[PDB]
Amino acid sequence: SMEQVAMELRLTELTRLLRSVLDQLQDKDPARIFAQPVSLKEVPDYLDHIKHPMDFATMRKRLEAQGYKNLHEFEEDFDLIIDNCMKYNARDTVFYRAAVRLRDQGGVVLRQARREVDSIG
């Protein structure tokens, strides 16, 4: 149907906006601490600690399958990145501190993305 097509065009445009948001967020992680999944070879107990692991590569795979239906979904996955790190790692670590910096800096980007997703509908 034409209605299905139009819904597909909206999903595509959302996907374009989210790809730009994701690039912007990832620039706030210049050390690439959150680029890839935590390795189970190197942290074999990770899944005893963290139930829903997340990372930028995994988000990117989801995005390119047009797997985010709305910004809420995407923000959920970004928040998991930060929130998992701040539970697994102690306050006095380079990991935790990088998460705090990513959260603070990413908040600015997401504040305006919310206005763009509403605005362009």
CATH code of the domain covering residue 111: 1.20.920.10
Q: How many other CB atoms are there within 10 angstroms of residue 85's CB atom?
A: 24
Owning domain of residue 34: 1-121
Rounded Cα distance, 80 and 64, in Å: 19
Q: How many other CB atoms are there within 10 angstroms of residue 71's CB atom?
A: 18
Q: Which tokens is 91 given?
A: 């306050």
Euclidean distance between the first and the last CA atom of the chain, given in angstroms as a whole number = 21
Rounded Cα distance, 80 and 120, in Å: 26
63 within 8 A of 14, measured Cβ to Cβ? no
- Count of domains observed in the chain: 1
Phi, psi of 53 (to 5 degrees): -60, 150
Rounded Cα distance, 48 and 6, in Å: 43
Identify the residue whose tokens are 């890839």: 36
Q: Is the dihedral of CA 62, 23, 34, 80 positive or negative?
A: negative
What residues have CB less than 8 Å from 70, skipping those under 6 apart? 14, 117
What residues have CB less than 8 Å from 15, skipping those under 6 apart? 63, 64, 66, 68
Phi, psi of 67 (to 5 degrees): -90, 0
Identify the residue whose tokens are 């501190």: 97
- Say which DSSP state 53 is in: -
What resolution, expressed in A, was reported for this entry?
A: 1.8
